[PDB]
Amino acid sequence: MEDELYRQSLEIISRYLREQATGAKDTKPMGRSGATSRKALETLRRVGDGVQRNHETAFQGMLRKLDIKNEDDVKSLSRVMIHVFSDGVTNWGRIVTLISFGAFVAKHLKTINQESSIEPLAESITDVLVRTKRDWLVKQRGWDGFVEFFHVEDLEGGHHHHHH
Ligand SMILES: O=C(NS(=O)(=O)Cc1ccccc1)c1ccc2c(c1)N(CC1CCC1)C[C@H](c1ccc(Cl)cc1Cl)O2
């Protein structure tokens, strides 16, 4: 599961869960390798946000039902996403509906001002995505492949590291 590429994987989804819960789209490329993480946060401003208005009728069917208000309502979902991925589609655009589901669950966790429940929500997506793509994200570089399949808002090109 974990790799040196995982410092560029989890840093896309833990930062976009905070784009919709706290407004933070990031301005400083992320820990270790993170120039691809900056490029992917630019892209999710349109491709992630467009799915918060196309599939959010199904997100409320799993957030009024689950009423996610703890880290225990999130760590129980790390079994579920094994069966949602498998191949996950190699266009990477089908994974965006789980990333924008997680960003709307993170917004319901900021209605009660929690944040230690949104750290395991990024892992319930991404640590389980690199369980089912334990060599396929490593081979395809699927986080750059996500930016190359859209590029709709990465016209700034991301990159140029700051802080860590
Ligand atoms: O690749 C996907 N594709 S998509 O979502 O864009 C397919 C779709 C098509 C039409 C309408 C809504 C989604 C995709 C991504 C994420 C998903 C799912 C599919 N499913 C099936 C979806 C069709 C019914 C919802 C649900 C799954 C999930 C989330 C949370 C919990 Cl508690 C349980 C489950 Cl099972 O998350």
Separation CA 7–CA 5 (nearest Å): 5
Q: Is residue 162 part of a domain?
A: no
**Is the shortest distance between the CB of 105 and ligand 1 below 6 Å?**
no
Which phi-psi region, left, alpha or beta, contains residue 12 (left: φ > 0; alpha: ψ -120 to 50)? Answer: alpha
Separation CA 28–CA 49 (nearest Å): 21
| Cα-based distances in Å from 13 to 34, 38, 64, 80, 143 | 12, 11, 22, 17, 11
Residue 127 · residue 10 · CB < 8 Å: yes
Radius of gyration from C-alpha coordinates of the chain: 15
* Domain span including residue 75: 3-150
Residue 52 · residue 137 · CB < 8 Å: no
Q: Is residue 163 part of a domain?
A: no
Show Cβ contacts of residue 15 under 8 Å, excluding neighbours closer than 6 positions. 24, 25, 26, 30, 37, 41
| Cα-based distances in Å from 115 to 3, 66, 78 | 25, 18, 17
Report the CATH number that the domain containing residue 67 is assigned in CATH.
Answer: 1.10.437.10
Q: Ligand 1 centroid vs 104 CA: distance in angstroms?
A: 14
> HSE on the CB side for 151, CA within 13 Å?
6
What SS3 class is residue 88?
coil
Show Cβ contacts of residue 135 under 8 Å, excluding neighbours closer than 6 positions. none
Q: Ligand 1 centroid vs 58 CA: distance in angstroms?
A: 8
Residue 104 · residue 63 · CB < 8 Å: yes
Q: Ligand 1 centroid vs 28 CA: distance in angstroms?
A: 31
Q: Is residue 42 part of a domain?
A: yes
